[PDB]
Amino acid sequence: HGAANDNFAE
Amino acid sequence: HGAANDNFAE
Amino acid sequence: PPEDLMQYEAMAQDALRGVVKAALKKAAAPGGLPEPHHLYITFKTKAAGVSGPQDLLSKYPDEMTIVLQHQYWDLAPGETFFSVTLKFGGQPKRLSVPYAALTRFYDPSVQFALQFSAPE
Amino acid sequence: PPEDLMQYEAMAQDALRGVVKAALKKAAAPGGLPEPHHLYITFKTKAAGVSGPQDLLSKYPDEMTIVLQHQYWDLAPGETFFSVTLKFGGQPKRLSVPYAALTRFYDPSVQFALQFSAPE
């Protein structure tokens, strides 16, 4: 994968 | 295949 | 599992029906298909939207294949369905088929094939 | 042989880019995607049509993957391209990506994947 944008759940 | 319409070349 | 709520497989099927439509537009182009390319279209006769001589339709209860190669006239591929004139027993007849009714696509020249309406 | 003058493979590729567009429309629907579905979109940064902060684009020379799951706002999927707001180092930024720029699609939840711009 390797996403560039932030993706931490909340 | 099995076409229903006529298809003899000319 | 897992149940696909996105129905990716169904969306891929519809997306692919579009190849038939694009192929029929090249075939409708003045001069026809670039030889030796020709098409075999198979469709559901009872699918809504399809029209044709009552006699002819009755002969083909569910499925019907037509070949677009040496004998077809006035191919008119709309955005949601296509109509064409073909000959049956030397008698010219008109047909209208929605892309939704399609179940199979095949071009013997490059052995390219597609199968729809089959969720397997 | 045989040389494909119909470019069936290319037409099938475009047809399939349409699945990405259809998936992004469900994601743009009020309420978002039906969990646990989320998307990984990979695209060519230099492809014509793509816009974004100059700084960001410079960081990703050719390829760039973005994930649409927990952090994305105002997803607007047009008919030829989509734009979205994402966060990079906590800083919100806008992006516009044409479906033509796409090279990969993946939804980890049902392991559905697609690969484009690759004629192989």
Automatic annotation (TrEMBL), chains C, D:
It comes from the Bacteria. One of its GO terms (molecular function) is identical protein binding. This is Stringent starvation protein B.
